Design a protein around this nucleic acid. Structure first.
Ligand SMILES: [Mg+2]
Ligand SMILES: [Mg+2]
Ligand SMILES: [Mg+2]
Ligand SMILES: [Mg+2]
Ligand SMILES: [Mg+2]
Ligand SMILES: [Mg+2]
Ligand SMILES: [Mg+2]
Ligand SMILES: [Mg+2]
Ligand SMILES: [Mg+2]
Ligand SMILES: [Mg+2]
Ligand SMILES: [Mg+2]
Ligand SMILES: [Mg+2]
Ligand SMILES: [Mg+2]
Ligand SMILES: [Mg+2]
Ligand SMILES: [Mg+2]
Ligand SMILES: [Mg+2]
Ligand SMILES: [Mg+2]
Ligand SMILES: [Mg+2]
Ligand SMILES: [Mg+2]
Ligand SMILES: [Mg+2]
Ligand SMILES: [Mg+2]
Ligand SMILES: [Mg+2]
Ligand SMILES: [Mg+2]
Ligand SMILES: [Mg+2]
Ligand SMILES: [Mg+2]
Lengths: 149, 70
RNA sequence: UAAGGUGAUAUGAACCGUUAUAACCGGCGAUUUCCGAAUGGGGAAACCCAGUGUGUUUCGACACACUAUCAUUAACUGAAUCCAUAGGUUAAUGAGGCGAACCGGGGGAACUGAAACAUCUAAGUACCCCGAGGAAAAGAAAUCAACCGAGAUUCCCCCAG
RNA sequence: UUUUGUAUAAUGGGUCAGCGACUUAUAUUCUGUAGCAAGGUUAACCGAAUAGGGGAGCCGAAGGGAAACCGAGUCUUAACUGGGCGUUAAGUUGCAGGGUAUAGACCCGAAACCCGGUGAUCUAGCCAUGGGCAGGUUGAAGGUUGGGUAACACUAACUGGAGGACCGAACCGACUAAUGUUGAAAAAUUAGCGGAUGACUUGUGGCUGGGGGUGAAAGGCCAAUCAAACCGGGAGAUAGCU
RNA sequence: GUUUAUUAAAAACACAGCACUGUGCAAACACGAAAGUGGACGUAUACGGUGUGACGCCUGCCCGGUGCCGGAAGGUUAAUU
RNA sequence: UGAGCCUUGAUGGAAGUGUGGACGCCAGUCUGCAUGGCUUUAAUGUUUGAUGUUCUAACGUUGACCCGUAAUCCGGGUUGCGGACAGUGUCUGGUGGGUAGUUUGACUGGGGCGGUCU
RNA sequence: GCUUGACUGCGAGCGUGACGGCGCGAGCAGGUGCGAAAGCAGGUCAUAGUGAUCCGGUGGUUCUGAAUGGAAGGGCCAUC
């Protein structure tokens, strides 16, 4: 026969699968000690419901934030000012805490996490393509511009 | 000997040499005994096999209730 | 209800009663030693012995009441293991034994018959065992009927030897 | 009474008195009798109970064929013939009787089988705990000492006290003969006889249960009973026999 | 020494000894539907079953038959599918 | 290790050097590495069987502890040994005088033996 | 020599049996063979060479077939 899971078990038995099980489904193992199953008519009625409902909480991350790039990439660029001296070298450095707050005031409480930023830029005045991502499949390339107040 | 769930035991029948005899026989069932409740502790019980299944079909726990009102 | 009575063998004795409260008959109640489920432990039934109370007490101590097992619940406890169960204590409830047939259920002979005897018969009888009631059991079609229909169970007559 | 046959010396009975064996139920069939008649009769039940009511139903007036089917005909056969069975036989319901059937089935009687209980106060084993064995013998092992050996063997006195050891009472048992044989006695008495510190003997209590026990074994013993105990039941077992 | 209590006390039963065989311990085996108990609070120098029956000198040939012990390759073969 | 699947290489795509291997019609393929331009059968897997080996977790324990409990019983717990074995139920072949019920004819110069039986 | 009468369906009336049953049989119907034809043939010169019933097996048939149509099964006939 076959039964649900509650773990992974050597055999296709990932958390939540109803296939390839053996006679005397545990009751001496995979059910008592560790995971369990008692599939029945009522126990799948709820568990099986997990397929559908989980896909929702998992869809949103790919629903609202998926193409959300525009709301942070619709602009040709963001622009921040600072201080320089040479051919445009920013003394300290403006970056996450800056680009973020700025665009945050705009409508993006973006965090300095998945941001591809290879370095705290703005050190050089001008453009700077800084791509950011909120979700795994999500990301967006946005150029930034450095200016001196 | 009475199988806790789906209670059964020593029914009597007779034999048959097909030729001659109708000596009385006698049945029994199956001894054996397991079970361990995942709602407290491993309570066990001696039950028949076709008696274990049944419990393990959709009781296992949803069945101790009858022994309550033994 | 009453002119008569204290049962019988059973008289005798000593008494009780007689123009509205002896005796007798009926209802309700009181008492009801001991043994016996026997139930405080025991036990060659009618007896041996004990724990906790109680009053009197001529204050010595004795007579009496309760203390069986088991289950439902409750209360208190409380192991191996944190808890938690197990187990212990208590209280109230009920059960236990005895019974004539009939009733339901578990188990279930052989003689005998077949002119022998193994299938088959006797027979689910005799017997054993559990359980209940004035009755049990059964009982409201997953019935039967045949294309019309009937309509729970139950028992009697018949269909038919 | 039983026989071919019995005065038979084959069976039964001492006598008397009382009791002692073809019944009963329903079914089926004949006979007699009564009712009614191509019709006869109700069952349970109801009941102003032996009425009356109730005709469910049973039997007969049609039979033939394995049947479908046909029908005073019908089967048979391909047959229209013949042959088989039928066709101007009154039945039916009571009552009394002859017989049969199912029953205990005229009455009495087995040896037995099966079911459930009672029995180890006899006896057989075994368990626990207690008791008994007058007297008289033999004289093992071990030991001491003397001899002896290089040392051990070995030997001699003595001490020692063994043994299902010896003679023999109690006690236990039963080999022989007589008597008893309606006994003193349902196994003994009399005179002898075997064992008698042992696999001994005995008191008290306990444990084994019937196809089971126990058995130094004879089928022996399990309460005067044993090739399957006693008591009650199936049970009026069955009895082609007396 | 034992035996037919109540017609048989024996040459019969027993006996110590001998032999075969089984049993590795939850032993074989036995009582028991089972639990359990005996064997044994023993453990192969032990326990059981069978036969012979001190001791002495011994105990020959037959494995065809039946039984038992080993093998189990191949033939035949149950339920089951 | 068979058989089925069915996903891949091998019966109807040109190199240069070295050298590995497999099949091979023995005019000669396929592929390894160092360097360069659908019919037949191998294996990963997956199913299903056959045997083995190992494991734990059922099952056993007439090993050792703790507790109930100042118990030899029982139970629950800790641990060790064994282990899907053993053991049991149902079904089934072989054994089976251990046990049970029975059968084992008549004629006959008695019965038997012999002989007979239509 | 020629053939298949070792035929199919019936059978007057008899013989013999306790019965089951057994035997004899002219004649009739349908189709046969042999003979020119009358006619003969329903196994062997006759008398032994045999087994009742039940349970089934095989073939045939609209006999029956449990609501109906079938079917299984049953009957009937033939036979083991
Ligand atoms: Mg008392
Ligand atoms: Mg008492
Ligand atoms: Mg008979
Ligand atoms: Mg005479
Ligand atoms: Mg005389
Ligand atoms: Mg005589
Ligand atoms: Mg007289
Ligand atoms: Mg006529
Ligand atoms: Mg002596
Ligand atoms: Mg004497
Ligand atoms: Mg003496
Ligand atoms: Mg005694
Ligand atoms: Mg006696
Ligand atoms: Mg009797
Ligand atoms: Mg009887
Ligand atoms: Mg009698
Ligand atoms: Mg002697
Ligand atoms: Mg004698
Ligand atoms: Mg004698
Ligand atoms: Mg001998
Ligand atoms: Mg020899
Ligand atoms: Mg026998
Ligand atoms: Mg009999
Ligand atoms: Mg004779
Ligand atoms: Mg002739």
């Amino acid at each position: 026969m076959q039964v649900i899971l509650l773990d992974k078990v050597a055999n296709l038995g990932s958390l939540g699968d109803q296939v390839n099980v053996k006679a005397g489904y545990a009751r001496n193992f995979l059910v008592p000690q560790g995971k369990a199953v008692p599939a029945t008519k009522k126990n799948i009625e709820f568990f099986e419901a997990r397929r559908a409902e989980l896909e929702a909480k998992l869809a949103e991350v790919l629903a609202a934030a998926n193409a959300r790039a525009e709301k942070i990439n619709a602009l040709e660029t963001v622009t921040i000012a600072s201080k320089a001296g040479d051919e445009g070298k920013l003394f300290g450095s403006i970056g996450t805490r800056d680009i973020a707050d700025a665009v945050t005031a705009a409508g993006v409480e973006v965090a300095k996490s998945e941001v591809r930023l290879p370095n705290g830029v703005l050190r050089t005045t001008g453009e700077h393509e800084v791509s950011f991502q909120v979700h795994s499949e999500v990301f967006a390339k946005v150029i930034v511009n450095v200016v001196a107040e | 000997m009475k199988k806790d769930i789906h209670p059964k035991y020593e029914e009597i029948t007779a034999s048959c040499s097909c030729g001659n005899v109708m000596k009385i026989r006698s049945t029994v069932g199956h001894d054996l005994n397991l079970d361990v409740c995942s709602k407290c502790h491993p309570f066990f019980t001696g039950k028949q096999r076709d008696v274990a299944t049944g419990g393990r079909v959709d009781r296992f726990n949803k069945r101790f209730n009858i022994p309550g009102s033994k």
